[PDB]
Design an enzyme around this catalytic site. Structure first.
Site, PDB file in Angstrom:
ATOM      1  N   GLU A   6       0.780  -1.333   0.066  1.00 49.79           N
ATOM      2  CA  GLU A   6       0.105  -0.111  -0.063  1.00 49.79           C
ATOM      3  C   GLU A   6       0.859   1.203  -0.049  1.00 49.79           C
ATOM      4  O   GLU A   6       0.587   2.124  -0.894  1.00 49.79           O
ATOM      5  CB  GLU A   6      -0.959   0.041   1.276  1.00 49.79           C
ATOM      6  CG  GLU A   6      -2.260  -0.834   0.921  1.00 49.79           C
ATOM      7  CD  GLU A   6      -3.007  -0.408  -0.089  1.00 49.79           C
ATOM      8  OE1 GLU A   6      -3.080   0.440  -0.711  1.00 49.79           O
ATOM      9  OE2 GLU A   6      -3.707  -1.654  -0.525  1.00 49.79           O
ATOM     10  N   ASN A  15      -6.846  10.025  -6.553  1.00 47.81           N
ATOM     11  CA  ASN A  15      -7.596   9.150  -7.652  1.00 47.81           C
ATOM     12  C   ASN A  15      -8.328  10.270  -8.488  1.00 47.81           C
ATOM     13  O   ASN A  15      -9.418  10.630  -8.265  1.00 47.81           O
ATOM     14  CB  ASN A  15      -8.594   8.320  -6.868  1.00 47.81           C
ATOM     15  CG  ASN A  15      -7.863   7.425  -5.973  1.00 47.81           C
ATOM     16  OD1 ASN A  15      -6.957   6.571  -6.270  1.00 47.81           O
ATOM     17  ND2 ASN A  15      -8.074   7.214  -4.430  1.00 47.81           N
ATOM     18  N   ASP A  42     -12.136   9.658  -9.293  1.00 45.18           N
ATOM     19  CA  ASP A  42     -13.201   9.835  -8.597  1.00 45.18           C
ATOM     20  C   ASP A  42     -13.088  11.036  -7.462  1.00 45.18           C
ATOM     21  O   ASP A  42     -14.038  11.108  -6.502  1.00 45.18           O
ATOM     22  CB  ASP A  42     -13.728   8.566  -7.725  1.00 45.18           C
ATOM     23  CG  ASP A  42     -12.895   8.150  -6.739  1.00 45.18           C
ATOM     24  OD1 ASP A  42     -11.983   8.493  -6.449  1.00 45.18           O
ATOM     25  OD2 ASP A  42     -13.552   7.239  -5.805  1.00 45.18           O
ATOM     26  N   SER A  52     -10.960  11.380  -4.794  1.00 37.74           N
ATOM     27  CA  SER A  52     -10.614  10.793  -3.503  1.00 37.74           C
ATOM     28  C   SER A  52      -9.339  10.794  -3.502  1.00 37.74           C
ATOM     29  O   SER A  52      -8.918  10.546  -4.477  1.00 37.74           O
ATOM     30  CB  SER A  52     -11.501   9.483  -3.082  1.00 37.74           C
ATOM     31  OG  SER A  52     -10.955   8.483  -3.870  1.00 37.74           O
ATOM     32  N   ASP A  76      -5.787   8.771  -1.216  1.00 37.36           N
ATOM     33  CA  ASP A  76      -5.617   7.688   0.014  1.00 37.36           C
ATOM     34  C   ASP A  76      -4.507   8.295   0.700  1.00 37.36           C
ATOM     35  O   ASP A  76      -3.428   8.768   0.115  1.00 37.36           O
ATOM     36  CB  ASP A  76      -5.245   6.380  -0.874  1.00 37.36           C
ATOM     37  CG  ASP A  76      -6.146   5.808  -1.842  1.00 37.36           C
ATOM     38  OD1 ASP A  76      -7.521   5.614  -1.352  1.00 37.36           O
ATOM     39  OD2 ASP A  76      -6.042   5.302  -2.841  1.00 37.36           O
ATOM     40  N   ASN A 113      -8.670   5.638   2.514  1.00 37.15           N
ATOM     41  CA  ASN A 113      -9.680   6.519   1.588  1.00 37.15           C
ATOM     42  C   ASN A 113     -10.531   7.746   1.974  1.00 37.15           C
ATOM     43  O   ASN A 113     -11.345   7.423   3.035  1.00 37.15           O
ATOM     44  CB  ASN A 113     -10.189   5.441   0.598  1.00 37.15           C
ATOM     45  CG  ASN A 113     -10.848   6.440  -0.723  1.00 37.15           C
ATOM     46  OD1 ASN A 113     -11.817   6.968  -0.670  1.00 37.15           O
ATOM     47  ND2 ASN A 113     -10.011   6.782  -1.810  1.00 37.15           N
TER      48      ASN A 113
END
Length: 130
Positions: free
Chosen positions: A35, A46, A49, A51, A53, A60
């Site tokens: 990750e 991202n 969309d 968002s 992380d 998220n």
């Protein structure tokens, strides 16, 4: 902060992650490795969309933490996303425990399925004294 492998392993064990909701320490290590590369300040936007992380477990902003700029976001961990960027990972760990309390469990992170599921993950904790 970028954690060294065994350093992180011992830290996660002390925070009660070993066996949490049926998830072994080695699985949590495999997850953090893919990750963020054990990097606490890792962030990823991202574009698709809107968002982002955040942190060692890449929480998220749409479901887990609040950053204020993500549309239709819930803040299930009840944390500012800033909290997932600290060198002290207590908050990031508390939010990761929250994620696995949902029915999908560790499968919530697609990376775990791609890189950890059904593999020999002993290597992540070997020699760490945990």
């Amino acid at each position: 902060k970028v954690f060294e492998r065994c350093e992180l392993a011992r830290t996660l064990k002390r925070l009660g992650m070993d066996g949490y909701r049926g998830i072994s320490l080695a699985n949590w290590m495999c997850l953090a490795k893919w990750e963020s590369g054990y990097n606490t300040r890792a962030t990823n936007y991202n574009a698709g969309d809107r968002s982002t992380d955040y942190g060692i477990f890449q929480g998220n902003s749409r479901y887990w933490c609040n950053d204020g700029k993500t549309p239709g976001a819930v803040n299930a961990c009840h944390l500012s996303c800033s909290a997932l960027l600290q060198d002290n990972i207590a908050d990031a760990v508390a939010c990761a425990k929250r994620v696995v309390r949902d029915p999908q469990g560790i499968r919530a992170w697609v990376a775990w399925r791609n890189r950890c599921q059904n593999r020999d993950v002993r290597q992540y904790v070997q020699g760490c004294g945990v």
